[PDB]
Each structure stands twice: as C-alpha cells, then as structure tokens.
Amino acid sequence: HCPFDTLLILDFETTSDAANQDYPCEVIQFAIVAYDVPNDKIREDISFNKYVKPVLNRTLTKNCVDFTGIPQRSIDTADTFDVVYEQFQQWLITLGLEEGKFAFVCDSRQDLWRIAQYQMKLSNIQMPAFFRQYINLYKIFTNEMDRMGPKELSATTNIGKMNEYYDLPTIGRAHDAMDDCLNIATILQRMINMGAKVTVNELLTCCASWRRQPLVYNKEWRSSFMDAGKIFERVLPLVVTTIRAGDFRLEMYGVCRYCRKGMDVCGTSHQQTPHDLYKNEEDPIHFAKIAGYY
Amino acid sequence: HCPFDTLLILDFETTSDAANQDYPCEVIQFAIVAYDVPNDKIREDISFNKYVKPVLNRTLTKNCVDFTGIPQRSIDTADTFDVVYEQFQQWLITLGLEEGKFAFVCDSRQDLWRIAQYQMKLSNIQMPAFFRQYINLYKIFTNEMDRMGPKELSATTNIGKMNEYYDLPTIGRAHDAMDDCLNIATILQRMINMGAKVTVNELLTCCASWRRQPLVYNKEWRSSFMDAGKIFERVLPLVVTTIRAGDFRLEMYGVCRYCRKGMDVCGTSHQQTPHDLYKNEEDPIHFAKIAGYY
Numbered sequence A, B: 001h002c003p004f005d006t007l008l009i010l011d012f013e014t015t016s017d018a019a020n021q022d023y024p025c026e027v028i029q030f031a032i033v034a035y036d037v038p039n040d041k042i043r044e045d046i047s048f049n050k051y052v053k054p055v056l057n058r059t060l061t062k063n064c065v066d067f068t069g070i071p072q073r074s075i076d077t078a079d080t081f082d083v084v085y086e087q088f089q090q091w092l093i094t095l096g097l098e099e100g101k102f103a104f105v106c107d108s109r110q111d112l113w114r115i116a117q118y119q120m121k122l123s124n125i126q127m128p129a130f131f132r133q134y135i136n137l138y139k140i141f142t143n144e145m146d147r148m149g150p151k152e153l154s155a156t157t158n159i160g161k162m163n164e165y166y167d168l169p170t171i172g173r174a175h176d177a178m179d180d181c182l183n184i185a186t187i188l189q190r191m192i193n194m195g196a197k198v199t200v201n202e203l204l205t206c207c208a209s210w211r212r213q214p215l216v217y218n219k220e221w222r223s224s225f226m227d228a229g230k231i232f233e234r235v236l237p238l239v240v241t242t243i244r245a246g247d248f249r250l251e252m253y254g255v256c257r258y259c260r261k262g263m264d265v266c267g268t269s270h271q272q273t274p275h276d277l278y279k280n281e282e283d284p285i286h287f288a289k290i291a292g293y294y
C-alpha cells in the first residue's frame, strides 16, 4: 500500500537558453493532474494548468519556444508567478485534502529541487512543506528495472525512458507540462500495477555534509548540464536527501530531515553559503546574482 | 565641406536573439567618439563608453554574447538606460559642444532610427533633436563608390564593406560598440581626406506618404532581418527621410522635416498607427505589445 490517498503529478516548464546553463529559469507553465490511490484512477478532470509571464526574461528565446512549443503570445497574456502560485493554493483548498495525506510526484528532482525552489526565491515565497517532500518517480523506476530486468533504452528523457520501458504510447507532445503530467500519471499507474512501491523518496533539507568542502570549480560549467547541476547544488539553500521506502513516515511532513525544526522556521536562510564560489567577479555566477544569493 | 565643427560617431549594441526578429531590443552598450572636424583629428580622449543593464530581457542570449562579445558580468554591474542616458546628457554638457553644431555619425540607419527610437520608448523618453538628424555614413559611402569607381566587396556588415573598399585594417573586434566606433571614425576621416562631403543626410520624421499604403504582410517576417525592417517601419512613430547634401541647412536642427513643428511638439504620438497590423490576435507582434504600441 502506498500511504497517500491522493497523488499530485506536477511538472513545470521554464524559460531557458539551451547552450547556457547560467540561466535564471523562470516558470512559464505550471501543470498538475490528480491521482486517486485507493481507486486507481487518473482524474484528469481535476487539473491545474496555467501559463506564467516571467519578469527577468520576458521574451522567450527561440530555442525555448522550440523545446516547449509554448508561443510568446501565450506568455504575454499570462499572470506572473506570484499570482498563478496563489491560484494554485486556492485550487488546492478546493480539493479538500487532508494536510500531509497527499504528495507530489515528479519526473525527476528538477521540478521541485531546482525549478520550484529557485522560482520561489525570485517570487520571494517561502517554500511550502508539500514541496519539501515528494515522489521522484524516475528514481523508483531505476529500482523497478533492477527487479524486473534491464532493457536497452534509446529514448532520451526520463519520461521517454519510462514510457519506452513500460511499453506505453506517448501522450501528446513532449515538454508541454500538462502533456508531461499525463504521461507521468499513466506511467505511475502502470508502475503501481506492476508492483512498484511508491512513497515519498526525496526530501529537501537545509544541510548536507558534502557541502562543507568547497566545490571543485570547473570553468566550462555553463555548457554542461551535469556540472551546472553541481553548482546549482551549492547555490540553492535546500538540497535533496534520499530516503528508503520502509523508512518514510507520514508525520515527517513538514519537519526538516536534518535539523528537525518546522518548515516555516527552516530554510528562510542558506545554512552552507558557498562563499568560496562568490569571491571572483572576473567569473561571477549570474543566476546567483539576479536571484540575490549574493 | 562639413558644416559641423564636431562629429560624434555613435554605435549601440543591443540584446537580441539571432533567429527571432520579433524581439524587444534593449541597449546594452553605448559608445561615442568625437572627431574634430577643423583639425581633421579623431579624439579617442573625447569619448563615452558605458555598458547598459536591460530590464525586459536581463540575461543575454548565448548567441548575443557570441555576436557582441559582451560578457554577462559587464551588464549585471551596469546601469539602466535611463541612468546612462542621463550620464550621456551630462557628458555632452561638460564637453560643451553647442547643440546644433555637432552631428551624430552612424554606420547605418539602425542606431538612431531603430535602436534609439525603440529604447527611448521603453525608457519613456522623448526623442531628442540630435537623434533626429544624423549622418548615415554608409549612405555617403555608396555615393562615394559611385563617384570614384565601384569594386567587388565580399564583407557582409557595412563597417566591413567600407574597410574593404578603402583598404583599411579592421580595428579591434566587430560588434563591440566602441570598436565599431573607432572603425567608423577611421573610415570617416579617410572619406573626408578623399574629398567626401560629410553632412546630415538622414532625418527622422513623423510621417510619410509611402506609409499611407498598408503593408503587405509577410507571415514569416520574424525570421528575416529585411522583412522585420518593414514591420519596424510601421510600428515606430518616426520614419527615415533622406535629404541631399545641397539642401541641408544647419537651422533645420530641432525642426521636423515633414510637419515643420518643433521636436518638442512633433514626436509625442504616432501619426500613422498601423491598425491593420494590430488586429490579428492569434499572431500578435510581441515587441509592439511589450513597448505599449498597443
């Protein structure tokens, strides 16, 4: 039994400029589809789907438009994140859910660890408890592949992979956040029926001991998604810690896995500020500066 | 030949996204170098050179930094245009060149007709007289070739063609505004030494009979520099009109060539608003929308 009655599949799309990783991503699409656990039903009549107007980079680069297929008129016409995120909160209450008895599900750590946290620094919104614990479905998927036996996967995204492996047709268009959500809900549902144990497996914590030793800087990092990741890790206050299925307990919402304080008192402030990175303004980190991490 | 005692070579560099013409260019570099007409001397010691921080698109596009060579750091520490423009105005005063007896010199109509006009709208500043009267050096150059003997030119930018024609070494790097300035300055000097009459040949006007005809809309304009130009001509209030060297009189300064009101009056609102373009709603013009052209 998965211990949540209802699972919320979330995906964002953001602003980007492909060849440049020192980029202050802003949310441009915010999508959710609800999943009924005891009933095993994807409920796509219980949705959230909004576009979002960025403030830092108002014009979407052509390559971003290409990736996401989101046309510029759709963002010009949208509200800013603070407004949209507010609508989100109202919509949540609409669902009459029991605090801590529902979890978000994403295709990776990107959506909540990186995207949501950063956007929320910008919009100056404290990160809520239900974003500080979630189900990284792809990680679960790695385990399911061990159990059920490896397979040759030519697909190129986390979703693509899971759809290929589970032998599921692609829903709609890649990188539309809602379409991404629909693929993940289907994947999740097939996963549960094939025997996957689905719980919270990632927690956002204020502190990790691998951040005490300054990071081995790598000059060409703004051209590598991996290496950018490593610096994203140092800059963002909250870092992803993992947790074994059998170790998770419902009542961990919403206390910090490291410092055990409440999530209205933890992460108002970086606990391992990477001063070592911020000391040479011959090569400064752009996304850290506009966000105001220094 | 030159009725001015001082010539200010001016070049701008802007934000951009190569493949997309429907882009709200903001000034990121502002460069000027003075040329002392009577002594025929370039004056690098009398120059202005500021980077400028954009507000609509704050993170330079990778191809933008590739094109211009401006690193993101130079703009994150820079001032916003409104501030820099005020510095410019101050600089002018302290050099105490008498308005009406200097003129700006550019490599094309781009700097003042497009770039300056648009940015001034963004920054909500009335177009000054000295931007409404200028020397398009390239225009003089095509007449000079006509007078002396055309030759085969392989270079693609205007500065490139002029350097190649007058057989001059490229100064610095292309698309650094200040370097562009130094090139233009050397081209001008040579032009003059070869007997060219260098005087204002382009004026910004409120109105033009050719704009009375609605523009035959090319649906793929956003990916063609030339067809974008057409759109840009209909949106921006002021239009380029040319004037023969024989006709220009110094006291045209501050007086609109078309309507004859003073430029305190002429300019404040669009005389030929392109309403025909602005009705298609599943295909809106982004740069117009963002600047408040509608």
Ligand SMILES: [Mn+2]
Binding pocket: A011, A012, A013, A175, A176, A177, A180
């Ligand atoms: Mn997605």
Ligand SMILES: [Mn+2]
Binding pocket: B011, B012, B013, B175, B176, B177, B180
């Ligand atoms: Mn230039």
Ligand SMILES: [Zn+2]
Binding pocket: A205, A206, A207, A256, A257, A258, A259, A260, A261, A266, A267
């Ligand atoms: Zn904590």
Ligand SMILES: [Zn+2]
Binding pocket: B205, B206, B207, B256, B257, B258, B259, B260, B261, B266, B267
């Ligand atoms: Zn006029």
